[PDB]
Design an enzyme around this catalytic site. Structure first.
Site, PDB file in Angstrom:
ATOM      1  N   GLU A 142      -4.132  -9.152  -0.754  1.00  0.00           N
ATOM      2  CA  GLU A 142      -4.705  -8.933   0.827  1.00  0.00           C
ATOM      3  C   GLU A 142      -5.769  -8.575   0.309  1.00  0.00           C
ATOM      4  O   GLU A 142      -7.119  -7.932  -0.334  1.00  0.00           O
ATOM      5  CB  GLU A 142      -3.713  -7.374   1.386  1.00  0.00           C
ATOM      6  CG  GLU A 142      -4.765  -6.983   2.752  1.00  0.00           C
ATOM      7  CD  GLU A 142      -4.636  -5.924   3.312  1.00  0.00           C
ATOM      8  OE1 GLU A 142      -2.630  -5.523   3.297  1.00  0.00           O
ATOM      9  OE2 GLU A 142      -4.807  -5.134   3.634  1.00  0.00           O
ATOM     10  N   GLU A 170       0.408  -1.298   0.265  1.00  0.00           N
ATOM     11  CA  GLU A 170      -0.049  -0.658   0.095  1.00  0.00           C
ATOM     12  C   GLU A 170       1.177   1.202   0.025  1.00  0.00           C
ATOM     13  O   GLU A 170       1.358   1.632   0.888  1.00  0.00           O
ATOM     14  CB  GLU A 170      -0.633  -0.106   0.738  1.00  0.00           C
ATOM     15  CG  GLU A 170      -2.423  -0.931   0.953  1.00  0.00           C
ATOM     16  CD  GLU A 170      -2.824  -0.969   2.109  1.00  0.00           C
ATOM     17  OE1 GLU A 170      -3.101  -0.246   3.207  1.00  0.00           O
ATOM     18  OE2 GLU A 170      -4.108  -2.067   2.146  1.00  0.00           O
TER      19      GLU A 170
END
Ligand SMILES: *[C@@H]1O[C@H](CO)[C@@H](O[C@@H]2O[C@H](CO)[C@@H](O)[C@H](O)[C@H]2NC(C)=O)[C@H](O)[C@H]1NC(C)=O
Ligand SMILES: CC(=O)N[C@@H]1[C@@H](O)[C@H](O)[C@@H](CO)O[C@@H]1O
Ligand SMILES: *[C@@H]1O[C@H](CO)[C@@H](O)[C@H](O)[C@H]1NC(C)=O
Lengths: 497, 497
Positions: free
Chosen positions: A340, A235
């Protein structure tokens, strides 16, 4: 072998209770004669991956919706399914007594279980750790001599990863993802908030962040564990948002691109782990196709990238066609992988909702949709958490498929766990998604794939309350008559020859 | 009516030749008046169950041998006598002309014959078949779509059973026994050799094997036949031997115990045939009491087992007390039953000695042993063989009470047939063995039972060469003065009121 021990907690379904001497499990799988299908059912009302069988008759008494298998229509090939071995997960797991620990791993990895063949491995602290550390926190250590592995890796992550691989049905692959660098390479000098790497790609800050990637690799290798792939960062969109609370390292697409090109790729390429594949954009689906356009249209980066890794936040809408769909179009030879997923942040929802079927449904609807849009593999967030939904050093904000009740030495299996199992257990690595045509519009989500040995597997989800009469045709075998109950999930299997 | 037509083949005694127009037969059965006894006599020298009658005396003067009936020493009740309809038998029987056939069946099943009241029926092919087959040879048909009866059942075994029932006037009970399961259920994938049911009880292999019994009984129900009982397996011990040549399926007793508790028991219980009795260990005597202890001390197995079935190899030794007696002692309420016996298995002896008296004696000697040790009934092996002792597809030939010569359209009744007849004809189902003490050591074998109507039957056998004079006292009525001629068998009957 042993069925589900249910327990309600005031939700629309139940979890399954395992302590240190009992857990629900599976028998060595059977392969019924050509003409005979297997069904696995789980229902909101309580059924949990229950095996039943029936005929594939060549007549057609079913006059509703038809799902026609189209085995000559061939799509992507599957890497597999797993989840992340976070500090949290390792901790919650080792709370349990050793016999409970094994019933737990088996649940995830064994043939008595659901057959995970992937484990995502965070590279040092993340929000799901009990402290903020990196593997070289000693300052101005630019050639990396104080690079070490903490108790965390040496006692928690690693020996569990070994045990997991012993028990495993199939070969397991390992994925790494860094959250933050050592804070003395950050523009902000702090593990979180708007703060990227120092200077520009090519310089010494940039070259060290690449050597750490190699070091992590050597270090895990002394303990005899090789990685299939690493993500460029977890991220990175997040490090550009001021006041981001979890450990995060910012990278604009333009920054990641040039980093991979000048530093990460070449460094990896020159090392004994040149075979570890690089993945990019380890971040949310709404960042595509843009991020891909930026990183991959430059030749010098693209030749290092093997895949794009995406994130499902199941609490948020995000149209697949425009995101993943468009992304495959623009680069059909670049693989999409889901690294994820999680659910539980809606401020008004308990973080951990024990026995929530809706959340299981949301999970599967997400994986099916995934594969219909070219995705090669899906990886859950934490393997295991506590009832509060932690331990997380910033805040609990997500549920998990297994919850550990440390005080009572038991652990629980959420509808989530089974909604995942309906995939991971029955779609080995190598399997290939194949065509599957609806005869008419229908409130169901479906997917069809083909094992390596050439046998079929079709998952069917029902998210409506009504039962649904259904016929699945296979050109080689015939017709499979069934009904799909409201709020349910079926995984069908059969020989074709 | 019609007497034996004797013929010799150079053995110690004769056979009774029968054909399509003639067979030795009995008059419709009668009873001796109170005060008179009835005698049936067979002797090596040619007499074949000759009926004679004589007086019961008020007083007896002597020093010679005295068998005293003890009406109150009450023992086992009697199920009955019969033999096994093997493919081999049916085939021999059905290859003679039709009136040759009726006479053959009446020889066994009519009141003008020896009135058998049990036929044991193999569930598919044994070593006395001319081809290996199960009812479900299609591989991995876990649902048994393609379960069915081949011709061996539908044109041979069944028609002949219907006809056998028709002629019988005592009700006949059927007993069924499997030698092998389909080969896909077995660990070694062969009909023979060391092998057993795959996996562990309660699993799919074991659940299928159970369902197979129910299908078996389903099919026979559709042809209007009900079975009084089934055996858990024929010679389970045999399935445990490397190299074993013919149909089998190996259980350790623990295997058999667990199978019965977890699968066979419940399956039978939840079905229309729940009434069907279940007999464990369809094997040899020396396996007792061991096997008995292992199965019967588990109550989840015991609640299903209605009795213990034993095989009697007559060429072979076993000590009655340490086997059957001890077992009765441990489980007085689990009935002992003899499910099979043969002569001519032993390596060095001929399969068929036509007219062997020595063989008949070996029969009755051991049928009397059976009764003395709590055995409730007796079931001979093949009803009919050919002069080779077959057909049998591993050439495992042995003798039979009836031998059929098809080239001559003729069948031959042996000493064994009459030796069995001395019991089977005169011991209706429900009889109760009672005491009979001798007044002194002596070479005779005897046994006493009372019928359901209350009257007496005593079988007396002489395996010595010398005539024994003797008297039987029954206090209700008096004394029978008689002689047991050397090498003879006498059956005595009288009223007690
Ligand atoms: C079947 O057996 C009967 C009896 O053995 C045979 O008939 C007897 O034998 C001879 C031949 O005619 C005669 O002396 C007697 O009159 C017959 N006795 C009786 C009691 O019938 C007959 O030969 C055999 N039948 C066949 C078809 O071979
Ligand atoms: C270790 C422990 O407390 N086990 C209990 C056990 O009594 C029970 O029968 C089983 C199923 O609920 O697991 C739980
Ligand atoms: C089984 O039986 C059905 C119906 O009797 C038949 O059509 C089918 O072809 C058989 N299957 C096999 C595998 O023999």
């Amino acid at each position: 072998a042993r069925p589900c021990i249910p327990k309600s907690f005031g939700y629309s379904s139940v979890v399954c209770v395992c302590n240190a001497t009992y857990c629900d499990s599976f028998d060595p799988p059977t392969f019924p004669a050509l003409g005979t299908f297997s069904r696995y059912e789980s229902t909101r009302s309580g059924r949990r991956m229950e095996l039943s069988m029936g005929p594939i008759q060549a007549n057609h008494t079913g006059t509703g919706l038809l799902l026609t298998l189209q085995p000559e229509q061939k799509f992507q090939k599957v890497k597999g399914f797993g989840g992340a071995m976070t500090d949290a997960a390792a901790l919650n797991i080792l709370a349990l007594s050793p016999p409970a620990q094994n019933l737990l791993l088996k649940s995830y990895f064994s043939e008595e279980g659901i057959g995970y063949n992937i484990i995502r491995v965070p590279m040092a602290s993340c929000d799901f750790s009990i402290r903020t550390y990196t593997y070289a926190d000693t300052p101005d250590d630019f050639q990396l001599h104080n690079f070490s592995l903490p108790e965390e890796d040496t006692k928690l992550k690693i020996p569990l990863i070994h045990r997991a691989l012993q028990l495993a049905q199939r070969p397991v692959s390992l994925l790494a993802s860094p959250w933050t660098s050592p804070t003395w390479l950050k523009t902000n000098g702090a593990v979180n908030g708007k703060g990227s790497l120092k200077g520009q790609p090519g310089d010494i800050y940039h070259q060290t962040w690449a050597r750490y990637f190699v070091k992590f690799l050597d270090a895990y290798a002394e303990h005899k564990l090789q990685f299939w792939a690493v993500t460029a960062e977890n991220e990175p969109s997040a490090g550009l948002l001021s006041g981001y609370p979890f450990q995060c390292l910012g990278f604009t697409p333009e920054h990641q691109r040039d980093f991979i090109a000048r530093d990460l790729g070449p460094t990896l390429a020159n090392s004994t782990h040149h075979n570890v594949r690089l993945l990019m954009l380890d971040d949310q689906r709404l960042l595509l196709p843009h991020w891909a356009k930026v990183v991959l249209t430059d030749p010098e980066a693209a030749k290092y990238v093997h895949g794009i890794a995406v994130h499902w936040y199941l609490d948020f809408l995000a149209p697949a066609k425009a995101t993943l769909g468009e992304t495959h179009r623009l680069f059909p030879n670049t693989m999409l992988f889901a690294s994820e997923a999680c659910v539980g942040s809606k401020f008004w929802e308990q973080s951990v909702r024990l026995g929530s079927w809706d959340r299981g449904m949301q999970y599967s609807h997400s994986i099916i949709t995934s594969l219909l849009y070219h995705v090669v593999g899906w990886t859950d967030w934490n393997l295991a958490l506590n009832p509060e939904g932690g331990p997380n050093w910033v805040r609990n904000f997500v549920d998990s498929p297994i919850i550990v009740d440390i005080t009572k030495d038991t652990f629980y299996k959420q509808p989530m766990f089974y909604h995942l199992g309906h995939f991971s257990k029955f779609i080995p690595e190598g399997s290939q998604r194949v065509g599957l045509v609806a005869s008419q519009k229908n409130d169901l989500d479906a997917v069809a794939l083909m094992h390596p040995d050439g046998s079929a597997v079709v998952v069917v989800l029902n998210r409506s309350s009504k039962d649904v009469p259904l016929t699945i045709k296979d050109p080689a075998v015939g017709f499979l008559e069934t009904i799909s109950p409201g709020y349910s999930i079926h995984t069908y299997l059969w020989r074709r020859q």
